[PDB]
Amino acid sequence: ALSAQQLLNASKIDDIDSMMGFERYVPPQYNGRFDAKDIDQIPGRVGWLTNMHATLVSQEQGISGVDFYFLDEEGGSFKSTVVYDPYFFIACNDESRVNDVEELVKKYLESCLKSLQIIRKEDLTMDNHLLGLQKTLIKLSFVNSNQLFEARKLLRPILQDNANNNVQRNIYNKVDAKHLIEDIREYDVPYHVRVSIDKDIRVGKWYKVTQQGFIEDTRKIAFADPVVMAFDIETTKPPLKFPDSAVDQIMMISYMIDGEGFLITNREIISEDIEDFEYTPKPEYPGFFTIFNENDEVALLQRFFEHIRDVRPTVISTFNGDFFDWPFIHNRSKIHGLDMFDEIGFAPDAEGEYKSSYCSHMDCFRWVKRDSYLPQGSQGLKAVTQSKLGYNPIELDPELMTPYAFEKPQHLSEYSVSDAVATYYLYMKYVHPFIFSLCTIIPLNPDETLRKGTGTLCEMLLMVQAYQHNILLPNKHTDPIERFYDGHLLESETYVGGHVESLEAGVFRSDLKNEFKIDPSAIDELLQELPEALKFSVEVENKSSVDKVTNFEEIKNQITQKLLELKENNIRNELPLIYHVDVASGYPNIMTTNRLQPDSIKTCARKLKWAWRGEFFPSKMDEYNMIKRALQNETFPVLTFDELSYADQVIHIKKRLTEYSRKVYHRVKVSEIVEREAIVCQRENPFYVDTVKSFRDRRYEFKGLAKTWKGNLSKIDPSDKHARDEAKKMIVLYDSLQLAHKVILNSFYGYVMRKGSRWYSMEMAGITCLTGATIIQMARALVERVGRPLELDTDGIWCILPKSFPETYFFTLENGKKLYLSYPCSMLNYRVHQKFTNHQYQELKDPLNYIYETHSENTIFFEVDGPYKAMILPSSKEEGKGIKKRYAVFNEDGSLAELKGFELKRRGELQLIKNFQSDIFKVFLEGDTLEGCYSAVASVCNRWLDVLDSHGLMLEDEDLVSLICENRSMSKTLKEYEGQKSTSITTARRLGDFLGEDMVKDKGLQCKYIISSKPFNAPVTERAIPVAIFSADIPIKRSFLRRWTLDPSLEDLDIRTIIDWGYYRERLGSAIQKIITIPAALQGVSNPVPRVEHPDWLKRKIA
DNA sequence: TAACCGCGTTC
DNA sequence: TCTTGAACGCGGTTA
Ligand SMILES: Nc1ncnc2c1ncn2[C@H]1C[C@H](O)[C@@H](COP(=O)(O)OP(=O)(O)OP(=O)(O)O)O1
Ligand SMILES: [Ca+2]
Ligand SMILES: [Ca+2]
Ligand SMILES: [Fe+3]
C-alpha cells in the first residue's frame, strides 16, 4: 500500500507548484475535429514546455500520469497533466494459443491488471520479418506503475519455473498455459520516458494544450526565456580540513538572477557590512551585485528562500552544488528548524542529488564532466572559466577563506561573487542552449538530459526510432557470470581496438630541412590514379561536375609536373610540410558505410573481419572442478558454499583458481587473438544505422560552422578588434557544440558493448575497429613511400612531406566560385573510395512489395589540417620503443596548436614537471638550425636542473612547496584499497592519522604529498609525506615527521632537508631525457644537456 | 625482467 | 540504482 507515500508526495508537489506559479490548467472542451492545421481555433493554452515529471492523480487508488510544466506567451506559467496507462508485453512461444495465455493472465493478474489486448510489432530477431511477418504479443495495461510492478513480481515466478524443469508424476507418460509465456518485454521503460516517446512530446518545443492533447506549434521558433538563477555558497572550515555542515556555518550565498547580482552575508561571521559593488570581468559579463547584509545565519537562509520564492525560477544552476552546496544548505536548514522542502520545494532524490518539481537544477559540473571535452585537470571552475568564458576569475587560497571573513571581508566577498558570475554565464552561454536543445530530441527532462550517461542518451534516441517504426525493443543485455574458451575459465574477453604507432621522434619545423627518400613506384601509382582522383575530388568531395570546371587540365598539369619532378630526384633534403590527416567521424562513418548495426550481425551478406582477444586462466576443466569441490567443503560467514550466491561462489573460485594456476603454470593469465568473421546482412531494418547517420549529420553542421567562422575570422583585418573578437567567440562556441556532440555520437559505437545494452554486439564493435586499422595502415603505406609519417593513432596520421610535394589547388567553376583541393588529402580519399566502399548496401525501394535496390556507399573521408610550424615528439628511455599519444604542435603564428598526453595537461602530476614542460615547448621554436634549436631547449633545461642541484635554495618557500608538490586524486575511499601500496594511499592514511578519520570519509580526496629522503633505501610509497603537515603547529608537526622518517633524532623540520632531492632530480632528468636529449640523439646531434647522462644502451649505440 | 595496477589521458 | 568502447604512458609493486 505504498500509494499512500506516493499520493501524498503528489499533493505536496501540487501545492508547491501552485506557490511557484504552476497551477494545473484544464483546457476548454472541443467537439470539432483534431487537426493541427486549425491550431488557432481549438480551445487551449499555448506554452513552452520546460519540464516534465511522472505523478499520480486522484480521479481529476492513484492514476499514473505526467505533469508538463509550461511557460506561456504572456509572461506567466502553468502546468498540464497527461494520463497514460503504463504497459508491457507478454511474448509467446506459439502464436496459435495466444488467446489461451490471454485467458490465463486475465485471471492470474486480475488483482492488478486493468485491460488486455493482442497487438503486433516487428521483431528483428524473427524469421521473415523483412517480408512483413510480425510477432504477436499480449499488451498488459495498468492503472499506475505500482500495479505494473506487481504484475512483474507475479509473472517472474512463471518465467523462472518455465526455465526450470517439470515435476515427478506418472513416469509412464497439449501444454499448460503457464509454459507458453516465453518472456515479458518492454517492462523496464521509465514511465515518463514511455509517455514522452508514445505521445511525441519533448521539452523545449512549443505546444498548445487542448482537450484532444498537445498540438506542437511549429510556428514558434525561439525558446522562451525562463528566469535563471545561479548560486554559490561559501562556508567556514577548520584549518587544513573540510567543511562540516554540522559545525561550520555558511558565510555567504552569492547568486545571480537573469543578470542581476546578489549577495547574502552572515554578519555573525563577516566582520563588516559590505556595500554594493561591481564585478564585470569582461564587457560581455555584467555583474552589478546588490548585497543583503543579514544578521543571523537563519536570516541568511530565510532571505535566500524568500528571494527564490518571489522571483520564481524554473532553472537553478550551480557548480558541484549537487554534492556540496545543496546538502550544506539543507543541513543548516534542518539544524535551524527550517524544512527546505516546504520553503523552496527542493529535496534530495534517490541518487542523493537535489531536485525540484517546477525548477531544473543544472549542476554545471555535470556538463563539464560529460560534454565540455576538457581534460580532468581543466575541469575545475577556474580552468573551465578561462577555457570557455575567456578570462581569469578571482582566486584565493581556501585555507585563508575562513580567516578572511574577519580580516579582509571585501576581498572574500569578491571571490564568492566571481564564482557566481562564472557559474551563471557559463550556464547561459554553454549549458543552457545545449541541454534544452538536446531535450527537443531526447525524451528526458532537463535534469536527466544533463546527468545521464551518453550511452543512456543514445539508448533513448534509439528507442524513439524503434518505437516509431513499430520495432519491439530487445530486453537489456545480461553477461554470464562464467564463460570458457578451450576449457579455460575466461577472465576477460574483448576485441582489438584502434591501431597506434610511434614512428619518429624529435623536432620537425617548417624552417629546418629534412631528408626524404621518395619511392619512385609510389609516384607512378598516383600518376596513374591522378585523372580519376581529381574527378573524385570534384564530383564526390565537392559535389560538382567536371563539365562546369574550367582549369581541370591546368591543375592536372601542375600536379603531374611536381609528381614527375619528385620521381626523378627521389632523394631530397628539403623543408617539410607538417601535416595532419584524420577521418571525419571515423567509427560512425565506418558503421554507416558498411551498414553496421547489432541487428545486422547474423547476396545480402557482407562478410567483414574482426579480431577477438581473450584472457583466460592456464588451468583446464580438470583443475577447475578440483578447486570447486575444495571450496565446497569449507565454511563461510555460519553458511555453506552451495548456500551462497552464484556470484560469491565464482568470486571464491576465481580467487583460488589464480593461486593454483600460478603454482602449476607459472602464469596467471593467457591472452590469445583469433581472426573472426561475421555476416553483416545488408537488408536489415536500418533503424540503428539511420539513427547514427542522423546524429552524425547533426554534429557535422556545427563542425562546419566552426570551420566557416575560422575562415570568417582570418578574412578580417587585425585592426577591427570588435569584429574579430566576435568571430573568435563563435569559433569557441561552435567548437564546443561539435565537441559536445562528438562523445554522444561515438557512444553509438560504444553502446553495442555497454552493460545492459538493448542492442549488444561484440562482433559489430570489432568489425568497426579492424576496418579502421586497415584503412589507417593503407594511408601510412602511401605516406611512408612519399613522406615520413611521425605518429599514427586509430584514424589519424601526423606526417611531414617534402615542400615540393603537390599541395593545395583551387578549381574554378563557370559560376566564378572556387572548389578547394588538398592533393595529399584527395589522393588518400580516392584510395579510400577504391578499396573500402560498400557495393552491397541495400534499401527498401518499394515497401508495399518488399523490393530492394543495391547501391554503393562510402562516407569515409580523411580531413587535413596544416601545414604546421613545428611538431615535437618525445622518445622512450628504453631502446627502440617509441612514445605514443604525446606531442606538441605549433601554428605558423607561433601559437600552440595541440598539446597531447603530457603531464602538463593531466590532472595532478609532479608540479615541477608540469612547469618544466610548460616552460620548454615554446622554446623548441627558437634557433636557426636544428643544433641551434636544441641549444635553446638546453638552456631552459639547465636552468631547471640548477634549481634541483641547488636543493631549491634559489626559490622562496611558497614557490618551493608549490613546485615540488605532487597532487593525486583517490577515486575510491582508502578502505577500498586494502592490500595495495601507493603514494596516494600512504598520503591519505597519514592525513587521517594527523587530521582525523573524517578526512578520508569521502572518495575523491586529493593527496598532495612530498617524498622524503628518510628512511634511506626504503620504498618510495613509504616516504610520501602529506604537505599539510608543514602548516600545522610545530609540536603536532615534529611528532609525525619523526614518526614518518623513523628518526626520533630529528628536529630540522624545514622542507629543504626532508625532501629526497635526488628523487626529483631523477624525475626531471627522465623528463629531459624523453623530450630533449634522446630525441636529439635520434636526429643525430650530441647531447645538449650533458648533465643528464645518456642511457647505457644509447652510449653504446654512439659507437 | 616482466606482469600488473590506478589514474588519466588519446583516440 | 546506475552504467559508451580500446590503446596507451608512467610511476610503482610484485612474482
Ligand atoms: N569518447 C569516445 N568514446 C567512444 N569512442 C571514441 C571516443 N573517442 C574516440 N572514439 C573512437 C571512435 C572515433 O570514431 C575514433 C576516432 O577518434 P577521433 O578521430 O578523435 O573522433 P572522430 O573521428 O569521430 O571525430 P573527428 O571527426 O573530429 O575526427 O575513436
Ligand atoms: Ca564556490
Ligand atoms: Ca577522426
Ligand atoms: Fe540476409
CSV table of N, CA and C in Angstrom, one decimal, chain A residues 272-321:
chain,number,residue,atom,x,y,z
A,272,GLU,N,32.4,43.1,8.8
A,272,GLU,CA,31.8,44.3,8.3
A,272,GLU,C,30.5,44.1,7.6
A,273,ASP,N,29.9,45.2,7.2
A,273,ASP,CA,28.7,45.2,6.3
A,273,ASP,C,29.2,45.7,4.9
A,274,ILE,N,29.1,44.9,3.9
A,274,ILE,CA,29.7,45.3,2.6
A,274,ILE,C,28.7,46.0,1.8
A,275,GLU,N,29.2,47.1,1.1
A,275,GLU,CA,28.4,47.9,0.2
A,275,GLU,C,28.3,47.3,-1.2
A,276,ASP,N,27.4,47.9,-2.0
A,276,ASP,CA,27.2,47.4,-3.4
A,276,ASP,C,28.3,47.7,-4.3
A,277,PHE,N,28.8,46.7,-5.0
A,277,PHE,CA,30.0,46.8,-5.8
A,277,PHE,C,29.7,46.1,-7.1
A,278,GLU,N,30.7,46.1,-8.0
A,278,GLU,CA,30.6,45.5,-9.4
A,278,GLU,C,31.7,44.6,-9.7
A,279,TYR,N,31.4,43.5,-10.4
A,279,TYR,CA,32.4,42.6,-11.0
A,279,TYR,C,32.0,42.3,-12.4
A,280,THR,N,32.7,42.9,-13.3
A,280,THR,CA,32.5,42.7,-14.8
A,280,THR,C,33.8,42.3,-15.4
A,281,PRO,N,34.1,41.0,-15.2
A,281,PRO,CA,35.5,40.5,-15.6
A,281,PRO,C,35.7,40.6,-17.1
A,282,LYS,N,34.7,40.8,-17.9
A,282,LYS,CA,34.8,41.1,-19.3
A,282,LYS,C,33.5,41.8,-19.7
A,283,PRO,N,33.5,42.7,-20.7
A,283,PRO,CA,32.4,43.6,-21.0
A,283,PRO,C,31.1,42.7,-21.3
A,284,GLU,N,31.2,41.5,-21.8
A,284,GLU,CA,30.1,40.7,-22.1
A,284,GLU,C,29.5,40.0,-20.9
A,285,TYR,N,30.0,40.2,-19.7
A,285,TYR,CA,29.6,39.6,-18.5
A,285,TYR,C,29.3,40.7,-17.4
A,286,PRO,N,28.3,41.4,-17.5
A,286,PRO,CA,28.0,42.4,-16.5
A,286,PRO,C,27.7,41.7,-15.1
A,287,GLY,N,28.1,42.4,-14.0
A,287,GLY,CA,27.9,41.9,-12.7
A,287,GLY,C,27.8,42.9,-11.6
A,288,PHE,N,26.7,43.7,-11.6
A,288,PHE,CA,26.4,44.6,-10.5
A,288,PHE,C,25.7,43.8,-9.4
A,289,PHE,N,26.3,43.9,-8.2
A,289,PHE,CA,25.9,43.0,-7.1
A,289,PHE,C,25.2,43.8,-6.0
A,290,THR,N,24.0,43.6,-5.8
A,290,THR,CA,23.3,44.1,-4.6
A,290,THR,C,23.5,43.1,-3.4
A,291,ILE,N,23.8,43.6,-2.2
A,291,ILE,CA,24.1,42.8,-1.1
A,291,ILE,C,23.0,42.9,-0.1
A,292,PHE,N,22.8,41.8,0.6
A,292,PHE,CA,21.8,41.7,1.7
A,292,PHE,C,22.6,41.3,3.0
A,293,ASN,N,23.1,42.3,3.6
A,293,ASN,CA,23.9,42.1,4.9
A,293,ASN,C,22.9,41.7,6.0
A,294,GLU,N,22.8,40.4,6.3
A,294,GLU,CA,21.9,39.9,7.3
A,294,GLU,C,22.6,39.6,8.6
A,295,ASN,N,21.8,39.5,9.6
A,295,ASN,CA,22.4,39.2,11.0
A,295,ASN,C,22.7,37.8,11.2
A,296,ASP,N,21.7,37.0,11.5
A,296,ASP,CA,21.9,35.6,11.8
A,296,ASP,C,22.1,34.7,10.6
A,297,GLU,N,22.5,33.5,10.8
A,297,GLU,CA,22.6,32.5,9.6
A,297,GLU,C,21.2,32.1,9.2
A,298,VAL,N,20.3,32.1,10.2
A,298,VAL,CA,18.9,31.9,9.9
A,298,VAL,C,18.4,33.0,9.0
A,299,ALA,N,18.7,34.2,9.3
A,299,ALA,CA,18.3,35.3,8.4
A,299,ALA,C,18.8,35.2,7.0
A,300,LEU,N,20.1,34.7,6.8
A,300,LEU,CA,20.6,34.4,5.5
A,300,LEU,C,19.8,33.4,4.8
A,301,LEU,N,19.6,32.2,5.4
A,301,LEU,CA,18.8,31.2,4.8
A,301,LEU,C,17.4,31.6,4.4
A,302,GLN,N,16.8,32.4,5.3
A,302,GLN,CA,15.4,32.8,5.1
A,302,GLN,C,15.3,33.9,4.0
A,303,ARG,N,16.4,34.7,3.7
A,303,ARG,CA,16.3,35.6,2.6
A,303,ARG,C,16.6,34.9,1.3
A,304,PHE,N,17.5,33.9,1.3
A,304,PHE,CA,17.7,33.1,0.1
A,304,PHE,C,16.4,32.4,-0.3
A,305,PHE,N,15.7,31.7,0.6
A,305,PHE,CA,14.5,31.0,0.3
A,305,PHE,C,13.4,32.0,-0.1
A,306,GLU,N,13.3,33.2,0.6
A,306,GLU,CA,12.3,34.1,0.3
A,306,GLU,C,12.6,34.8,-1.1
A,307,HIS,N,13.8,35.0,-1.4
A,307,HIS,CA,14.1,35.5,-2.8
A,307,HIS,C,13.8,34.5,-3.9
A,308,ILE,N,14.1,33.2,-3.6
A,308,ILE,CA,13.8,32.2,-4.6
A,308,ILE,C,12.3,32.2,-4.8
A,309,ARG,N,11.5,32.2,-3.7
A,309,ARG,CA,10.0,32.1,-3.9
A,309,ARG,C,9.4,33.3,-4.7
A,310,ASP,N,10.0,34.4,-4.6
A,310,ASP,CA,9.4,35.6,-5.2
A,310,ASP,C,9.8,35.7,-6.7
A,311,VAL,N,11.1,35.5,-7.0
A,311,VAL,CA,11.4,35.5,-8.5
A,311,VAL,C,11.0,34.3,-9.2
A,312,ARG,N,10.6,33.2,-8.6
A,312,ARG,CA,10.0,32.0,-9.1
A,312,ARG,C,10.9,31.5,-10.3
A,313,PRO,N,12.1,30.9,-10.0
A,313,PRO,CA,12.9,30.4,-11.1
A,313,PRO,C,12.6,29.0,-11.5
A,314,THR,N,12.6,28.8,-12.8
A,314,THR,CA,12.5,27.4,-13.3
A,314,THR,C,13.8,26.8,-13.7
A,315,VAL,N,14.9,27.5,-13.5
A,315,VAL,CA,16.2,26.9,-13.6
A,315,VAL,C,17.1,27.5,-12.5
A,316,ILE,N,17.7,26.6,-11.7
A,316,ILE,CA,18.7,27.0,-10.7
A,316,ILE,C,20.0,26.2,-11.0
A,317,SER,N,21.0,27.0,-11.3
A,317,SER,CA,22.3,26.5,-11.7
A,317,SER,C,23.3,26.6,-10.6
A,318,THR,N,24.2,25.6,-10.5
A,318,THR,CA,25.3,25.6,-9.5
A,318,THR,C,26.5,25.0,-10.2
A,319,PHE,N,27.6,25.0,-9.4
A,319,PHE,CA,28.8,24.3,-9.8
A,319,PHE,C,29.1,23.3,-8.7
A,320,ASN,N,28.9,22.0,-8.9
A,320,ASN,CA,29.0,20.9,-8.0
A,320,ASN,C,28.1,21.1,-6.7
A,321,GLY,N,27.0,21.9,-6.9
A,321,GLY,CA,26.1,22.1,-5.8
A,321,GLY,C,25.4,20.8,-5.4
